[PDB]
Amino acid sequence: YPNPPLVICFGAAQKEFVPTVRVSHEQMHQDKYSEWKMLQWNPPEFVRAP
Amino acid sequence: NEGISTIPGFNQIQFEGFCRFIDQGLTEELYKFPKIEDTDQEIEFQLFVETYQLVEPL
């Protein structure tokens, strides 16, 4: 056995998947995704480190 | 509201300036136009800022 202990990551393989989805009070524009980056500066409490 | 999340356009200043002009300055200047009252026996009129129509260039 190699020196670094092996770890097993059991689950599913998905490209970009955010499982924690709740309701956010503040919302942004519907179509303009160029201003959706503002909510990644002050994120909701549950999506601070997804 | 634009420009708070990305870099604004380099021609937005003159764009909004010309828009503000063609929106309010023409009417503001036509309002201060004086009224000429003469030609009693003749048919004339004054400057009424009610139509205010600009036609597209041919």
Side-chain angles (χ1 to χ4, degrees), chain A residues 1-24 26-44 46 48-50, chain B residues 1-4 6-32 34 49 51-58:
Chain A
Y1 292 159
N3 199 331
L6 181 62
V7 299
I8 297 181
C9 298
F10 185 82
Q14 291 158 335
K15 183 64 62 60
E16 296 293 337
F17 186 84
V18 181
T20 62
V21 177
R22 306 182 67 181
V23 184
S24 180
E26 197 275 348
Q27 199 178 170
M28 279 297 180
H29 203 268
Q30 308 176 179
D31 304 330
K32 300 181 180 180
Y33 47 82
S34 60
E35 70 179 47
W36 292 359
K37 66 175 65 63
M38 307 184 64
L39 224 35
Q40 298 245 334
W41 294 341
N42 182 23
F46 62 94
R48 182 166 290 268
Chain B
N1 49 15
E2 299 291 338
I4 58 180
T6 176
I7 293 181
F10 294 150
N11 58 271
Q12 291 293 337
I13 299 299
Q14 296 174 343
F15 196 100
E16 68 181 358
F18 183 78
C19 290
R20 172 190 303 269
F21 167 73
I22 207 169
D23 202 334
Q24 66 183 15
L26 295 181
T27 62
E28 181 178 355
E29 292 298 330
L30 287 179
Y31 277 160
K32 62 176 58 181
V49 197
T51 310
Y52 184 66
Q53 288 182 179
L54 288 77
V55 190
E56 61 176 356
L58 66 157

PDB file of all heavy atoms in Angstrom, chain A residues 17-33, unseen atoms left out:
ATOM      1  N   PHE A  17     -23.608  20.538 -10.026  1.00  0.00           N
ATOM      2  CA  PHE A  17     -24.847  20.180  -9.350  1.00  0.00           C
ATOM      3  C   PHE A  17     -24.851  20.797  -7.961  1.00  0.00           C
ATOM      4  O   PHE A  17     -24.019  20.442  -7.121  1.00  0.00           O
ATOM      5  CB  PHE A  17     -24.993  18.658  -9.268  1.00  0.00           C
ATOM      6  CG  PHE A  17     -26.310  18.201  -8.721  1.00  0.00           C
ATOM      7  CD1 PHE A  17     -27.410  18.083  -9.550  1.00  0.00           C
ATOM      8  CD2 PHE A  17     -26.445  17.874  -7.383  1.00  0.00           C
ATOM      9  CE1 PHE A  17     -28.620  17.655  -9.054  1.00  0.00           C
ATOM     10  CE2 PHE A  17     -27.656  17.446  -6.880  1.00  0.00           C
ATOM     11  CZ  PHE A  17     -28.746  17.336  -7.718  1.00  0.00           C
ATOM     12  N   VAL A  18     -25.782  21.714  -7.723  1.00  0.00           N
ATOM     13  CA  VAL A  18     -25.948  22.335  -6.411  1.00  0.00           C
ATOM     14  C   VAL A  18     -27.155  21.701  -5.731  1.00  0.00           C
ATOM     15  O   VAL A  18     -28.301  22.034  -6.068  1.00  0.00           O
ATOM     16  CB  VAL A  18     -26.106  23.857  -6.528  1.00  0.00           C
ATOM     17  CG1 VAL A  18     -26.262  24.481  -5.152  1.00  0.00           C
ATOM     18  CG2 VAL A  18     -24.918  24.457  -7.259  1.00  0.00           C
ATOM     19  N   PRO A  19     -26.953  20.786  -4.779  1.00  0.00           N
ATOM     20  CA  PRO A  19     -28.114  20.111  -4.177  1.00  0.00           C
ATOM     21  C   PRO A  19     -28.915  21.000  -3.245  1.00  0.00           C
ATOM     22  O   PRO A  19     -30.146  20.884  -3.198  1.00  0.00           O
ATOM     23  CB  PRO A  19     -27.475  18.929  -3.437  1.00  0.00           C
ATOM     24  CG  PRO A  19     -26.100  19.399  -3.109  1.00  0.00           C
ATOM     25  CD  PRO A  19     -25.676  20.279  -4.252  1.00  0.00           C
ATOM     26  N   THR A  20     -28.260  21.887  -2.501  1.00  0.00           N
ATOM     27  CA  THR A  20     -28.948  22.750  -1.542  1.00  0.00           C
ATOM     28  C   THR A  20     -29.645  23.868  -2.304  1.00  0.00           C
ATOM     29  O   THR A  20     -29.013  24.833  -2.736  1.00  0.00           O
ATOM     30  CB  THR A  20     -27.966  23.312  -0.520  1.00  0.00           C
ATOM     31  OG1 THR A  20     -26.994  24.127  -1.187  1.00  0.00           O
ATOM     32  CG2 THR A  20     -27.255  22.184   0.210  1.00  0.00           C
ATOM     33  N   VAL A  21     -30.960  23.740  -2.470  1.00  0.00           N
ATOM     34  CA  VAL A  21     -31.773  24.728  -3.172  1.00  0.00           C
ATOM     35  C   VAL A  21     -32.906  25.139  -2.243  1.00  0.00           C
ATOM     36  O   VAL A  21     -33.788  24.328  -1.936  1.00  0.00           O
ATOM     37  CB  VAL A  21     -32.326  24.192  -4.499  1.00  0.00           C
ATOM     38  CG1 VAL A  21     -33.216  25.231  -5.158  1.00  0.00           C
ATOM     39  CG2 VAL A  21     -31.189  23.792  -5.426  1.00  0.00           C
ATOM     40  N   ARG A  22     -32.884  26.393  -1.794  1.00  0.00           N
ATOM     41  CA  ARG A  22     -33.942  26.926  -0.945  1.00  0.00           C
ATOM     42  C   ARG A  22     -34.492  28.217  -1.539  1.00  0.00           C
ATOM     43  O   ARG A  22     -34.163  28.572  -2.675  1.00  0.00           O
ATOM     44  CB  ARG A  22     -33.429  27.168   0.475  1.00  0.00           C
ATOM     45  CG  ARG A  22     -32.784  25.954   1.116  1.00  0.00           C
ATOM     46  CD  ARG A  22     -32.345  26.252   2.538  1.00  0.00           C
ATOM     47  NE  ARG A  22     -33.482  26.494   3.420  1.00  0.00           N
ATOM     48  CZ  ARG A  22     -33.376  26.792   4.710  1.00  0.00           C
ATOM     49  NH1 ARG A  22     -32.181  26.891   5.274  1.00  0.00           N
ATOM     50  NH2 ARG A  22     -34.466  26.994   5.437  1.00  0.00           N
ATOM     51  N   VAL A  23     -35.328  28.921  -0.785  1.00  0.00           N
ATOM     52  CA  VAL A  23     -35.940  30.160  -1.251  1.00  0.00           C
ATOM     53  C   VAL A  23     -35.095  31.336  -0.780  1.00  0.00           C
ATOM     54  O   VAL A  23     -34.741  31.426   0.402  1.00  0.00           O
ATOM     55  CB  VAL A  23     -37.386  30.283  -0.745  1.00  0.00           C
ATOM     56  CG1 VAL A  23     -38.046  31.523  -1.326  1.00  0.00           C
ATOM     57  CG2 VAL A  23     -38.178  29.038  -1.101  1.00  0.00           C
ATOM     58  N   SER A  24     -34.772  32.235  -1.703  1.00  0.00           N
ATOM     59  CA  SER A  24     -33.995  33.430  -1.408  1.00  0.00           C
ATOM     60  C   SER A  24     -34.904  34.651  -1.433  1.00  0.00           C
ATOM     61  O   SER A  24     -35.777  34.770  -2.299  1.00  0.00           O
ATOM     62  CB  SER A  24     -32.852  33.607  -2.410  1.00  0.00           C
ATOM     63  OG  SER A  24     -32.101  34.774  -2.125  1.00  0.00           O
ATOM     64  N   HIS A  25     -34.693  35.559  -0.480  1.00  0.00           N
ATOM     65  CA  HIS A  25     -35.529  36.752  -0.392  1.00  0.00           C
ATOM     66  C   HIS A  25     -35.212  37.726  -1.520  1.00  0.00           C
ATOM     67  O   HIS A  25     -36.100  38.126  -2.283  1.00  0.00           O
ATOM     68  CB  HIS A  25     -35.344  37.421   0.970  1.00  0.00           C
ATOM     69  N   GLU A  26     -33.948  38.119  -1.642  1.00  0.00           N
ATOM     70  CA  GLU A  26     -33.542  39.049  -2.684  1.00  0.00           C
ATOM     71  C   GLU A  26     -33.361  38.313  -4.005  1.00  0.00           C
ATOM     72  O   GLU A  26     -32.827  37.202  -4.047  1.00  0.00           O
ATOM     73  CB  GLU A  26     -32.247  39.759  -2.287  1.00  0.00           C
ATOM     74  CG  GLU A  26     -31.946  41.023  -3.082  1.00  0.00           C
ATOM     75  CD  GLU A  26     -31.232  40.742  -4.388  1.00  0.00           C
ATOM     76  OE1 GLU A  26     -30.766  39.600  -4.575  1.00  0.00           O
ATOM     77  OE2 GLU A  26     -31.135  41.662  -5.227  1.00  0.00           O
ATOM     78  N   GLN A  27     -33.810  38.944  -5.087  1.00  0.00           N
ATOM     79  CA  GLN A  27     -33.746  38.351  -6.414  1.00  0.00           C
ATOM     80  C   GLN A  27     -33.237  39.395  -7.399  1.00  0.00           C
ATOM     81  O   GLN A  27     -33.255  40.598  -7.125  1.00  0.00           O
ATOM     82  CB  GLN A  27     -35.118  37.812  -6.847  1.00  0.00           C
ATOM     83  CG  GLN A  27     -35.075  36.794  -7.973  1.00  0.00           C
ATOM     84  CD  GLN A  27     -36.450  36.270  -8.333  1.00  0.00           C
ATOM     85  OE1 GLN A  27     -36.620  35.578  -9.335  1.00  0.00           O
ATOM     86  NE2 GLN A  27     -37.441  36.599  -7.513  1.00  0.00           N
ATOM     87  N   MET A  28     -32.785  38.922  -8.553  1.00  0.00           N
ATOM     88  CA  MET A  28     -32.214  39.764  -9.594  1.00  0.00           C
ATOM     89  C   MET A  28     -33.069  39.675 -10.859  1.00  0.00           C
ATOM     90  O   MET A  28     -34.160  39.098 -10.859  1.00  0.00           O
ATOM     91  CB  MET A  28     -30.760  39.372  -9.866  1.00  0.00           C
ATOM     92  CG  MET A  28     -29.770  39.945  -8.870  1.00  0.00           C
ATOM     93  SD  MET A  28     -29.727  41.746  -8.914  1.00  0.00           S
ATOM     94  CE  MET A  28     -28.504  42.096  -7.655  1.00  0.00           C
ATOM     95  N   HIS A  29     -32.561  40.265 -11.938  1.00  0.00           N
ATOM     96  CA  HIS A  29     -33.295  40.323 -13.194  1.00  0.00           C
ATOM     97  C   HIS A  29     -33.539  38.920 -13.744  1.00  0.00           C
ATOM     98  O   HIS A  29     -32.844  37.958 -13.410  1.00  0.00           O
ATOM     99  CB  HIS A  29     -32.535  41.165 -14.215  1.00  0.00           C
ATOM    100  CG  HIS A  29     -33.397  41.728 -15.302  1.00  0.00           C
ATOM    101  ND1 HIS A  29     -33.598  41.081 -16.503  1.00  0.00           N
ATOM    102  CD2 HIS A  29     -34.103  42.880 -15.373  1.00  0.00           C
ATOM    103  CE1 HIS A  29     -34.396  41.809 -17.264  1.00  0.00           C
ATOM    104  NE2 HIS A  29     -34.716  42.906 -16.602  1.00  0.00           N
ATOM    105  N   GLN A  30     -34.548  38.816 -14.610  1.00  0.00           N
ATOM    106  CA  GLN A  30     -34.936  37.523 -15.160  1.00  0.00           C
ATOM    107  C   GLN A  30     -33.978  37.066 -16.252  1.00  0.00           C
ATOM    108  O   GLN A  30     -33.524  35.916 -16.249  1.00  0.00           O
ATOM    109  CB  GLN A  30     -36.360  37.595 -15.712  1.00  0.00           C
ATOM    110  CG  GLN A  30     -37.383  38.151 -14.744  1.00  0.00           C
ATOM    111  CD  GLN A  30     -38.751  38.297 -15.378  1.00  0.00           C
ATOM    112  OE1 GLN A  30     -39.707  38.723 -14.730  1.00  0.00           O
ATOM    113  NE2 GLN A  30     -38.849  37.946 -16.656  1.00  0.00           N
ATOM    114  N   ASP A  31     -33.662  37.951 -17.194  1.00  0.00           N
ATOM    115  CA  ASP A  31     -32.914  37.584 -18.390  1.00  0.00           C
ATOM    116  C   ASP A  31     -31.447  37.979 -18.332  1.00  0.00           C
ATOM    117  O   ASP A  31     -30.588  37.214 -18.782  1.00  0.00           O
ATOM    118  CB  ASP A  31     -33.560  38.222 -19.623  1.00  0.00           C
ATOM    119  CG  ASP A  31     -35.020  37.850 -19.774  1.00  0.00           C
ATOM    120  OD1 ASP A  31     -35.400  36.741 -19.345  1.00  0.00           O
ATOM    121  OD2 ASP A  31     -35.789  38.668 -20.322  1.00  0.00           O
ATOM    122  N   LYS A  32     -31.132  39.154 -17.789  1.00  0.00           N
ATOM    123  CA  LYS A  32     -29.759  39.642 -17.790  1.00  0.00           C
ATOM    124  C   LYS A  32     -28.897  38.869 -16.802  1.00  0.00           C
ATOM    125  O   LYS A  32     -28.864  39.194 -15.611  1.00  0.00           O
ATOM    126  CB  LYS A  32     -29.721  41.136 -17.465  1.00  0.00           C
ATOM    127  CG  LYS A  32     -30.478  42.006 -18.452  1.00  0.00           C
ATOM    128  CD  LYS A  32     -30.373  43.475 -18.082  1.00  0.00           C
ATOM    129  CE  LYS A  32     -31.137  44.347 -19.066  1.00  0.00           C
ATOM    130  NZ  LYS A  32     -31.042  45.791 -18.717  1.00  0.00           N
ATOM    131  N   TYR A  33     -28.196  37.843 -17.286  1.00  0.00           N
ATOM    132  CA  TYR A  33     -27.275  37.094 -16.442  1.00  0.00           C
ATOM    133  C   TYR A  33     -25.969  37.834 -16.193  1.00  0.00           C
ATOM    134  O   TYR A  33     -25.154  37.366 -15.391  1.00  0.00           O
ATOM    135  CB  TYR A  33     -26.983  35.723 -17.057  1.00  0.00           C
ATOM    136  CG  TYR A  33     -26.644  35.755 -18.529  1.00  0.00           C
ATOM    137  CD1 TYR A  33     -25.363  36.062 -18.963  1.00  0.00           C
ATOM    138  CD2 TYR A  33     -27.607  35.467 -19.486  1.00  0.00           C
ATOM    139  CE1 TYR A  33     -25.053  36.090 -20.308  1.00  0.00           C
ATOM    140  CE2 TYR A  33     -27.305  35.491 -20.832  1.00  0.00           C
ATOM    141  CZ  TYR A  33     -26.025  35.803 -21.238  1.00  0.00           C
ATOM    142  OH  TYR A  33     -25.723  35.829 -22.578  1.00  0.00           O
TER     143      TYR A  33
END
